[PDB]
Design brief:
Two copies of one chain form a homodimer. By secondary structure, chain A is an alpha+beta fold. Helices cover 33% and strands 16% of the residues of chain A. The first copy, chain A, folds into two domains: 1-91, 2-Layer Sandwich (Phosphorylase Kinase, domain 1), CATH 3.30.200.20; 92-295, Transferase(Phosphotransferase), domain 1 (Orthogonal Bundle), CATH 1.10.510. The N and C termini of chain A lie far apart (43 Å). Bound molecules: phosphoaminophosphonic acid-adenylate ester and magnesium ion (3 copies). It is classed as transferase.
């Protein structure tokens, strides 16, 4: 009951990849409206799981800080080949905040840009949490901007639920640098699970990434980072130039033990997030920066 | 064919069509302009600054010759994009058109291969690994997906430059942890393994997980979230086949590859003398059955 995308959506060009498959800029054939399309090989036995995932993705993406999910499709392939799942969502033209910080001189964003982006993240997270959804994959590549300097979350955890063989697309662990300590199983933490507060740790790491251009432990092998995170104290900003408010917000996101980590609503009331005077001009500064870099 | 340089591929190799998706960039069918020889090309975006790193890694490349069980690695190229724009790294490798062992087992009834097929494929894997190992090179990614077939039923290891592991380090891929299922305990850092060592015997563990994958169509723990499996691999005892139909030789072989402590794991040569691998009476028939199966599949 998932259809071929032919005549409905079509691929335009790659915008990025990693993990598994790639993401294209895509187009709704009949209106010319853009979309992002995630394309990845799947077996036909995955189909039942996909319909559950897409259903969840659509239901929870109707908030201004989440990229809205449009639909999923399966482009059947000739005998022998695997069919391609196409996952179709809102196109975010300005790209990821990881890209942003990369294309910015100094690999560092102004403090008030960081406060604005982090609030937008928290609001998106707030929406998901109240609906009992853990994002579980927060990081710079999963935070996107529109042409109009709007901020949107993408790729919140759906699945795995189904007591099935996990499909290839879900068998890859991914970059670990944004993962909370409690999420990484060890002797004392054998069943290590997500908690909504797991996303808040990730938002703190994303904030450091905006400040320094890379997450903590970036000079280490990913596997070794996996080992260190549950053992290390909370990461810290390296420069002292930042405001007392910024330091305190980082401290809040990065509370080692998640039991005393603040909730999403609490961080939204944190002075660094809550009190933002130059908002309007931030937007404009962001808007203008985006244009400069496209060109 | 040059394995120490890094030229633009213009007028040398050209892309003709996307053939599939490897780890993690796209794999094209390509041909060498001047000979018309087919090749698989793995393509990856890289930043200007990554290109100095790439140079260092090419210097670290170890040299080894062709071998009938290794898809030949032809070398690397950087295709330049206009300034500002990210370039592409091209990794060129011998083309094999008959799919992977994973394709092979997934396209059977019951997702399972005959024991004499597994013995045959496993030996070919081990032979390729011996050649690598004797030249001081670790493959690092032994698994069904990375074991390919030709139209002639030749078994060959994927080699997009295993000495340098470029297809796993460039364009941020170095930040990824991939799939854990075929990993040896020693590559997984855990409370008892602060620094995850890769050893040549790591491949032998993975060859053992691959024989299980041939026998059951999937690696152990395939039902777990990869994070949960990552934790379990260093802690569980050696995995084993589910069914009991299998011969004692086959059970013994799996046991031989899957020693938890790599220091106590056999070497490639030792494992090539395992009776499961060493004694293959129906060898020629097997290769026939294989050649045939391949053909009917193209049809
Ligand atoms: N809706 C979108 N609009 C514009 N760009 C996008 C969109 N979704 C993803 N991208 C970009 O495409 C590139 C590939 O993203 P993706 O395949 O999701 O990998 P990832 O985010 O780095 N890891 P993961 O989400 O855990 O699989 C990233 O740079 C994304 O920011
Ligand atoms: Mg939305
Ligand atoms: Mg993304
Ligand atoms: Mg993503």
């Amino acid at each position: 009951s998932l259809r071929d995308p032919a005549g409905i959506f079509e691929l335009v060009e790659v915008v990025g990849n990693g993990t598994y498959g790639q993401v294209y800029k895509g187009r709704h054939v009949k209106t010319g409206q853009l979309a992002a399309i995630k394309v990845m090989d799947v077996t036909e036995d995955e189909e039942e799981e996909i319909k559950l995932e897409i259903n969840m993705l659509k239901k929870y993406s109707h908030h201004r800080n989440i990229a809205t999910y449009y639909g999923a499709f399966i482009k059947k392939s000739p005998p022998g080949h695997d069919d391609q799942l196409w996952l179709v969502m809102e196109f975010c033209g300005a790209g990821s905040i990881t890209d942003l910080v990369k294309n910015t001189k100094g690999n560092t964003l102004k403090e008030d840009w960081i406060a604005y982006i982090s609030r937008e993240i928290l609001r998106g997270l707030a929406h998901l949490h109240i609906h009992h959804v853990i994002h579980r994959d927060i990081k710079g590549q999963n935070v996107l901007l529109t042409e109009n300097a709007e901020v949107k979350l993408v790729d919140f955890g759906v699945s795995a639920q189904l007591d099935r063989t996990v499909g290839r697309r879900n068998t890859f662990i991914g970059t670990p640098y944004w993962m909370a300590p409690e999420v990484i199983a060890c002797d004392e933490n054998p069943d290590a699970t997500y908690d909504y507060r797991s996303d808040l740790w990730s938002c703190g790491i994303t904030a450091i990434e905006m400040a320094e251009g890379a997450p903590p432990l970036c000079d280490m092998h990913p596997m070794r980072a996996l080992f260190l995170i549950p053992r290390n104290p909370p990461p810290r900003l390296k420069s002292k130039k930042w405001s007392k408010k910024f330091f305190s917000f980082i401290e809040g996101c990065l509370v080692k033990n998640y039991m005393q980590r603040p909730s999403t609503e609490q961080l939204l009331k944190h002075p660094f997030i809550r009190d933002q005077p130059n908002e309007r001009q931030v937007r404009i500064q962001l808007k203008d920066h985006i244009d400069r870099t496209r060109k």
